[PDB]
């Protein structure tokens, strides 16, 4: 029972780490996308 509890806790922590990583990675993805949009608008303005 003790071993099973340890294994179950480790599996929960693994899955939660994976999901939190997915969330944070998407957040940085959209942040970088916004930075890229600002970048391209700046480039066209400076070229004109």
């Amino acid at each position: 029972a003790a071993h099973a509890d340890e294994v179950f806790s480790l599996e929960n922590r693994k899955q939660q780490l994976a999901l939190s990583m997915e969330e944070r990675k998407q957040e940085v993805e959209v942040h970088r996308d916004g930075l890229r949009a600002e970048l391209r608008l700046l480039r066209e303005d400076v070229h004109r």
Partner: protein, 50 residues
């Protein structure tokens, strides 16, 4: 003769109890082996997950 018959009946009762206890011991020994195997498997799983 009544006394002898009664003592005999007690004898077969005790013999049946002995045989039942031996059967229970065999079952519990099998469960011992199975549980220890599960212990080992879950220990390996714990190391892998860590």
């Amino acid at each position: 003769f009544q006394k002898k018959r009664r003592l005999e009946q007690q004898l077969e009762g005790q013999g049946k109890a002995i045989k039942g206890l031996t059967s229970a011991m065999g079952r519990l020994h099998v469960d011992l082996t199975r549980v220890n195997g599960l212990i080992a498997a879950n220990s390996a799983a714990r190391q892998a997950l860590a």
